[PDB]
């Protein structure tokens, strides 16, 4: 017996409700300022513990942030002073990273760090060998995204974690596009994991950063230093106050994703197959290794596609996805496909297309 209605389309109704409940509690006459304070504290700690558990981490190994952007900066710039102190100034990353990994690292490159920006080539997938080949005794950090946001191509962060964990080098993973979608990979001993709320259907303005302890090293978490100051919040790593409703929204989005992953997987792949079959006779071209890809992101090159044909098929793609999912379309910044070995004319002619089942 189902008695509910299906109002919200860009955010699951259960996520919306929890957010709303917490906001009205924050705004309303829900007890007194004190009584809500107790409630909000316990709620945040419940969220922290549940979220940490989805990556096999202890509650004290996770902080909340204002987004994966802030998580990435905290993780990467936060390691710079330790790097200067121990003479570990070599960083390895990929040239296909999101700007919230690229830019902090380009900032460090201008401050005396040596940063290697590895190019994956046409597969769009960094290889383990490619990283391990560049590994040095004084390599501070490897940063590798879990899933490329433009192409959906899954990186081998789980394999790398097993190898880097046995070294003094830290691994950071920007999992904004991987969290929830490839859960198994993030239970591996990756040192730092950045998580984005809105990527898994939570409100914008909230994220998380996992910082794992290493048992051998007395019992230290990553030796991060703060980039902001003023308050004890989030183990001093993120001072100020985050909005409690959004944090609780993040935890609910995660919980839905963990529980309904199989359903999401099937519906996303089912739509993928139908979209691909529509694209088969069009001379759009698929970018990235399709053996290593999240089911819900497709990157298409329209280099050989004339303008009128472009418009027709985009209509047909949206229409195929209708009543099954909501869709997104965006031009891909040329740098990502140039890092994948594409010539200029093609690298600036790509469309990112993704869908979220309803």
Author numbering: 2 to 359
Which sentences did the original study use to describe this structure?
DNA phosphorothioation is a unique type of epigenetic modification which occurs on the DNA backbone. During this process, a sulfur atom replaces a non-bridging oxygen atom of the phosphodiester backbone of DNA. Therefore, it has been suggested that the DndA-catalyzed sulfur mobilization is the first step during the DNA phosphorothioation procedure.
On the other hand, we successfully crystallized the C327S mutant of DndA (referred to as DndA hereafter), and determined its crystal structure to a resolution of 2.4 Å. In the crystal structure, DndA forms a homodimer in which the two protomers are related by a two-fold rotation axis, similar to other cysteine desulfurases IscS, NifS, SufS, and CsdB. In each protomer, there is a PLP cofactor which forms a Schiff base covalent bond with the amino group of Lys200. Each protomer of DndA consists of a larger N-terminal domain and a smaller C-terminal domain. Similar to other cysteine desulfurases, DndA uses a deep surface pocket to harbor the PLP cofactor. For example, His99 uses its imidazole ring to stack on top of the pyridine ring of PLP, making multiple van der Waals interactions with it. Moreover, the main chain of Ala69, the main chain and side chain of Thr70, and the side chains of Ser197 and His199 hydrogen bond to the phosphate group of PLP. In contrast to previously determined structures of cysteine desulfurases/selenocysteine lyase, in which the catalytic cysteines are all located on flexible loops, the catalytic cysteine Cys327 of DndA (mutated to serine in our study) was found to reside on a β strand. The distance between Cys327 and PLP is about 16 Å, and the distance between Cys327 and the presumable position of L-cysteine substrate is also more than 10 Å. Therefore, a dramatic conformational change is needed for Cys327 to approach near the L-cysteine substrate to carry out the nucleophilic attack.
